[PDB]
Paper text:
Here, the crystal structure of a 9-O-SAE from Phocaeicola vulgatus (PvSAE) is reported. Structural characterization revealed PvSAE to be a dimer with an SGNH fold, named after the conserved sequence motif of this family, and a Ser–His–Asp catalytic triad. Biochemical assays also show that PvSAE deacetylates both mucin and the acetylated chromophore para-nitrophenyl acetate. Therefore, bacteria employ esterases to make acetylated sialic acid more accessible for cleavage by sialidases.
Numbering used by the authors:
A (entry chain BBB): 22 to 221
B (entry chain AAA): 21 to 221
Amino acid sequence: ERKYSTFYEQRATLFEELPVTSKDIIFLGNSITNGCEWAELFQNKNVKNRGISGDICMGVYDRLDPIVKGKPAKIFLLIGINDVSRGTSADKIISEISMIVRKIKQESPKTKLYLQSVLPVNDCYGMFNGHTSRWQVVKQINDLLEPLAVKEGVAYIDLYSHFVEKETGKMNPVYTNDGLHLLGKGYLLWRDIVKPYVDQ
Amino acid sequence: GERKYSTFYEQRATLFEELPVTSKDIIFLGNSITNGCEWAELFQNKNVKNRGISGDICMGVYDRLDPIVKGKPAKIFLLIGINDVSRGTSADKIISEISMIVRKIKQESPKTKLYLQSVLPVNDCYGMFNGHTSRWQVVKQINDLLEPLAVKEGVAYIDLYSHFVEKETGKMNPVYTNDGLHLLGKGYLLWRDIVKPYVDQ
Ligand SMILES: [Mg+2]
Ligand SMILES: [Mg+2]
């Protein structure tokens, strides 16, 4: 909306005022990143939120500078579900994620970059139909995102296999109250999956 | 619309239920104006924690005190009411509900220092959140009563409003906002400057 536009500039202007240091562990993405208290979840003061609700691949791309100038230890990226909601193809989304990977590697070569599987979605709550109705695209993106990681020599994290239900290909509803965002237990699963990579 | 705000509240609330609160913790508690900051970064203080929920109202804050107060935090910083203003709620009923937050906090964690922060001015200039912005006058009505309440209950009143407002208009200085309601980074630096002395008492 005009709200997501305005919220973007609020969060982006704030991040411009906060220093990133070489010890930092950045979580970078859309609402699913924005929704967490990352330092609390890992109990690690070097872990920082660079999530913006409604963010898309090129929104993340356009605000790398206040993050990369700090040369953080780690970036955990989760992006693309909002690009799905706009009818963008997995291939187009992969090309944009490529720009982010290559920009990070060039501006901050020492940063460990971890590409996180797009999370599954679920239309069972009848919300975010632009997202939940393109549930098949989640798999499409990750089947390309993993080889993108191998080619660019960066880690791929499979969150998807944990959050997904075997026989639907949709978000386990115990992780979500809308089919898109995580409840507490959703972030506790994330924590258990990614924790070993926060402590590499 | 209100469904996304309702589900977002349960999302933030259930996460806070999994996040332990301790005797050293400094809590920023309130609505999207609290939610929007990275508090521990703003104050370079690992003890400072975000319990902001976009869209929250006084009774939404009241109903979620348990997982904050049971850890007996060092400080709570409260900023709440503008979403109640947006529902046509009177400054009197708002104060009434803020008074129940204050007594629950004292009762459950009496060593917790509580700080009551002036409700921030709004500005209809951007034509956004017209529920909030048309009612810019109700801001100062709440604050006229909020300072005497603090004094009554023996808790701090922090005046943010006098720094954010344009005295000529009675509205949010557009330099701190792109929508009439929420803060730009600059907005949060002005907030830090005002509150850091209370954060470090
Ligand atoms: Mg559920
Ligand atoms: Mg402005």
